[PDB]
Design an enzyme around this catalytic site. Structure first.
Site, PDB file in Angstrom:
ATOM      1  N   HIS A  32       0.826  -1.213   0.000  1.00  0.00           N
ATOM      2  CA  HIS A  32       0.000   0.000   0.000  1.00  0.00           C
ATOM      3  C   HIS A  32       0.859   1.261   0.000  1.00  0.00           C
ATOM      4  O   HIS A  32       1.733   1.425   0.872  1.00  0.00           O
ATOM      5  CB  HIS A  32      -0.887   0.016   1.242  1.00  0.00           C
ATOM      6  CG  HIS A  32      -1.608   1.301   1.455  1.00  0.00           C
ATOM      7  ND1 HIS A  32      -1.248   2.207   2.434  1.00  0.00           N
ATOM      8  CD2 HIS A  32      -2.681   1.829   0.824  1.00  0.00           C
ATOM      9  CE1 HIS A  32      -2.073   3.236   2.395  1.00  0.00           C
ATOM     10  NE2 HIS A  32      -2.948   3.032   1.426  1.00  0.00           N
ATOM     11  N   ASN A  33       0.581   2.151  -0.966  1.00  0.00           N
ATOM     12  CA  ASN A  33       1.311   3.418  -1.145  1.00  0.00           C
ATOM     13  C   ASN A  33       2.780   3.137  -1.044  1.00  0.00           C
ATOM     14  O   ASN A  33       3.493   3.720  -0.214  1.00  0.00           O
ATOM     15  CB  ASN A  33       0.914   4.432  -0.083  1.00  0.00           C
ATOM     16  CG  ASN A  33      -0.447   5.049  -0.358  1.00  0.00           C
ATOM     17  OD1 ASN A  33      -1.048   4.804  -1.395  1.00  0.00           O
ATOM     18  ND2 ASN A  33      -0.928   5.854   0.572  1.00  0.00           N
ATOM     19  N   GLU A  42       1.906   0.236  -5.728  1.00  0.00           N
ATOM     20  CA  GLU A  42       1.029   1.385  -5.907  1.00  0.00           C
ATOM     21  C   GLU A  42       1.767   2.662  -6.254  1.00  0.00           C
ATOM     22  O   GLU A  42       2.728   3.089  -5.595  1.00  0.00           O
ATOM     23  CB  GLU A  42       0.136   1.616  -4.670  1.00  0.00           C
ATOM     24  CG  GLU A  42      -1.039   0.610  -4.560  1.00  0.00           C
ATOM     25  CD  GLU A  42      -1.808   0.652  -3.228  1.00  0.00           C
ATOM     26  OE1 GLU A  42      -1.689   1.643  -2.486  1.00  0.00           O
ATOM     27  OE2 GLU A  42      -2.607  -0.279  -2.973  1.00  0.00           O
ATOM     28  N   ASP A  47       1.018   6.701  -6.976  1.00  0.00           N
ATOM     29  CA  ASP A  47       0.085   7.832  -6.898  1.00  0.00           C
ATOM     30  C   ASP A  47       0.683   8.988  -7.721  1.00  0.00           C
ATOM     31  O   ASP A  47       1.533   9.761  -7.238  1.00  0.00           O
ATOM     32  CB  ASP A  47      -0.172   8.261  -5.446  1.00  0.00           C
ATOM     33  CG  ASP A  47      -0.924   7.182  -4.624  1.00  0.00           C
ATOM     34  OD1 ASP A  47      -1.370   6.165  -5.224  1.00  0.00           O
ATOM     35  OD2 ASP A  47      -1.088   7.358  -3.385  1.00  0.00           O
ATOM     36  N   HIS A  88       2.049  11.227  -1.940  1.00  0.00           N
ATOM     37  CA  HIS A  88       0.721  11.028  -1.355  1.00  0.00           C
ATOM     38  C   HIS A  88      -0.169  12.248  -1.505  1.00  0.00           C
ATOM     39  O   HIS A  88       0.010  13.255  -0.811  1.00  0.00           O
ATOM     40  CB  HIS A  88       0.862  10.657   0.120  1.00  0.00           C
ATOM     41  CG  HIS A  88      -0.406  10.146   0.720  1.00  0.00           C
ATOM     42  ND1 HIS A  88      -0.662  10.186   2.077  1.00  0.00           N
ATOM     43  CD2 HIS A  88      -1.503   9.609   0.135  1.00  0.00           C
ATOM     44  CE1 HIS A  88      -1.865   9.686   2.294  1.00  0.00           C
ATOM     45  NE2 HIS A  88      -2.394   9.327   1.134  1.00  0.00           N
ATOM     46  N   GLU A  91      -2.783   5.382  -9.699  1.00  0.00           N
ATOM     47  CA  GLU A  91      -3.842   6.234  -9.224  1.00  0.00           C
ATOM     48  C   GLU A  91      -3.627   7.571  -9.894  1.00  0.00           C
ATOM     49  O   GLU A  91      -3.227   8.505  -9.296  1.00  0.00           O
ATOM     50  CB  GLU A  91      -3.780   6.410  -7.703  1.00  0.00           C
ATOM     51  CG  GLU A  91      -5.032   7.028  -7.083  1.00  0.00           C
ATOM     52  CD  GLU A  91      -4.839   7.445  -5.625  1.00  0.00           C
ATOM     53  OE1 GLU A  91      -3.709   7.776  -5.235  1.00  0.00           O
ATOM     54  OE2 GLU A  91      -5.834   7.508  -4.880  1.00  0.00           O
ATOM     55  N   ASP A  95       9.798  -7.011  30.691  1.00  0.00           N
ATOM     56  CA  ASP A  95      10.115  -5.879  31.523  1.00  0.00           C
ATOM     57  C   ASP A  95       9.028  -5.565  32.539  1.00  0.00           C
ATOM     58  O   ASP A  95       7.848  -5.367  32.192  1.00  0.00           O
ATOM     59  CB  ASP A  95      10.530  -4.660  30.732  1.00  0.00           C
ATOM     60  CG  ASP A  95      11.480  -3.794  31.506  1.00  0.00           C
ATOM     61  OD1 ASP A  95      11.121  -3.412  32.643  1.00  0.00           O
ATOM     62  OD2 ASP A  95      12.635  -3.639  31.058  1.00  0.00           O
TER      63      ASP A  95
HETATM   64 CA   LIG Z   1      13.742  -7.120  30.738  1.00  0.00          CA
HETATM   65 CA   LIG Z   2      -2.784   4.466  -3.197  1.00  0.00          CA
END
Ligand SMILES: [Ca+2]
Ligand SMILES: [Ca+2]
Ligand SMILES: [Ca+2]
Length: 513
Positions: free
Chosen positions: A112-113, A142, A144, A157, A191, A465
């Protein structure tokens, strides 16, 4: 000391025991005993002297034993740490599936993108992004496209502050890496936001750069279904709107015409043409799966569906692909740049079938008449309960979570089942304190899995942790049918999908009906 230490530090009881059981009194494993091991314990099906003898010829360090067709504990361990001892089936690590069905029958590695390296709003874009994804076996990319200075179309984008790059530069990168990881077809999702002139520049570049790799005409005979990965081997195909839009581009769209979701049907009606591809946001797909699971499934038998991350995922976070695969959705696009359980599962799925990027769906998801619905399970070929027992024995050289060269990991292991809703589960071991070299848990979990054909088993190791969040140490995701049985080593990967040369988990995996 030097010997009594060297050995102890480098000593593995669980291994000793295992060899003992297999070999018993003898100090060696005779081919006959190996074969029994291979069958009784490893459940190999090709288990026979031929297999045993190859194992020995491949892994036995002792010349005496090798020549005399025997396996020493050393060779036993070597085998166990090899690609043959890997919990992830070596056999499935090469293309072995039927590559002759129509595209809609395979899950397809999709990005994606693709151009983005970071977040969706202001982070950078780069050809590197396309290179990496391709090197990870991604098949669906993809682009754009927007108008750029000097009549050169750019990619970035739309409506954001993401950095930009050139459409042409992108095309060369794709050209160069498209098949480094697989021979199967690459799909470029365009796109287009380009003016008419720049659109023409686009088409020019495509033709110029891609040359003959570009598929610009229908395959001869490809008439009622999408072609097969085999038929499109070595090709790059375009997906986009087909006749605002110049013909130069429009005419290059052959099997992937961008379309708005009509609905699911049955006949040569609304439920789009095989050469039509509809897209769905994470949200919409879920809803459709929730409400018309079987319709979607059936739709996906002969049609390619693209799913993409919800708009709120501006951090480039990913959703779970599994939920979409369960509906037969093939082009499930994820943000390849983002480490997480999602991409772990994703690349685990696609390490299958030789990592070629196309994984044949189970038969019931290739049956235009299935009554399957992962959401409303009924009796059918997909219902095939298995009892999976996994014993997390020990860990070997767990990577320092990078958190002070004077601290020692306090590892624990999480084992998860990913698949249809009822099958999903997770279990965890205790924490071993200050031991990453050779922690020993010797803990076992048992899971009941009703639809194994859609499951994946994931091993995750964390640095416990008290005061904080546990650091991810390593992981491994294995598709159900590639899960090997017996004593095996799970080879841990880092957050970025990289191999950890010596980081392993030693386990015993039993699957029974
Ligand atoms: Ca640790
Ligand atoms: Ca896209
Ligand atoms: Ca510690």
């Amino acid at each position: 000391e030097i010997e009594t230490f060297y050995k102890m530090l480098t000593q593995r009881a669980e291994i000793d025991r295992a060899f003992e059981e297999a070999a018993g009194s003898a100090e060696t494993l005779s081919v006959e005993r190996l074969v029994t091991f291979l069958q009784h314990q490893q459940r190999e099906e090709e288990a026979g002297p031929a297999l045993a003898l190859s194992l020995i010829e491949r892994y036995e360090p002792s010349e005496t034993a090798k020549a005399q067709r025997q396996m020493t504990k050393d060779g036993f361990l070597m085998y166990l740490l090899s690609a043959d001892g890997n919990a992830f089936s070596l056999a499935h690590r090469r293309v072995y599936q039927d590559m002759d069905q129509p595209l809609s029958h395979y899950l397809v590695s999709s990005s994606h993108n693709t151009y983005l390296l970071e977040d969706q709003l202001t982070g950078p874009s780069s050809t590197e992004a396309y290179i990496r994804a391709l090197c990870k076996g991604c098949r669906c990319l993809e682009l754009d496209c927007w108008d750029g200075p000097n009549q050169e179309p750019i990619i970035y984008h739309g409506y954001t502050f993401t950095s930009k790059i050139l459409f042409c530069d992108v095309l060369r990168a794709i050209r160069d890496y498209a098949f480094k990881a697989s021979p199967y077809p690459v799909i470029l999702s365009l796109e287009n936001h380009c003016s008419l002139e720049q659109q023409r520049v686009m088409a020019r570049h495509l033709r110029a750069i891609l040359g003959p790799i570009l598929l610009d005409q229908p395959l001869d005979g490809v008439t009622t279904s999408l072609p097969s990965p085999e038929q499109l081997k070595g090709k790059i195909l375009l997906k986009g709107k087909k006749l605002k839009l110049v013909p130069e581009l429009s005419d290059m769209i052959i099997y992937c015409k961008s379309v708005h979701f009509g609905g699911f049907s049955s006949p040569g009606t609304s439920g789009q043409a095989f050469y039509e591809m509809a897209s769905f946001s994470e949200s919409r797909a879920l809803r459709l799966l929730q409400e018309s699971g079987n319709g979607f499934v059936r739709h996906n038998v002969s049609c390619l569906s693209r799913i993409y991350p919800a708009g709120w995922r501006t951090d480039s976070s990913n959703y779970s692909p599994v939920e979409m695969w369960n509906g037969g959705c093939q082009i499930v696009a994820l943000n390849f740049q983002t480490p997480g359980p999602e991409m772990d599962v994703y690349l685990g799925c696609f390490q299958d079938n030789g990592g070629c990027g196309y994984v044949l769906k189970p038969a019931f998801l290739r049956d235009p008449n299935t009554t399957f619905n992962s959401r409303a399970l009924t009796q059918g070929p997909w219902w095939r309960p298995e009892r999976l027992r996994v014993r997390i024995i020990s860990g070997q050289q767990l990577p320092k979570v990078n958190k002070n060269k004077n601290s020692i990991v306090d590892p624990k292991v999480i084992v998860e089942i990913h698949g249809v809703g009822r099958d999903t589960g997770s279990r965890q071991t205790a924490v071993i304190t200050n031991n990453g070299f050779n922690p020993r848990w010797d803990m076992e979990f048992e899971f009941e899995v009703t639809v194994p054909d859609l499951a994946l088993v994931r091993f995750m190791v964390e640095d416990y942790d008290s005061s904080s969040k546990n650091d991810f140490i390593g992981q491994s995701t294995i598709p159900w049918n590639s899960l090997k049985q017996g004593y095996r080593h799970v080879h841990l990967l880092s957050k970025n999908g990289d191999q950890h040369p010596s980081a392993t988990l030693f386990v015993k995996i039993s699957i029974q009906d």
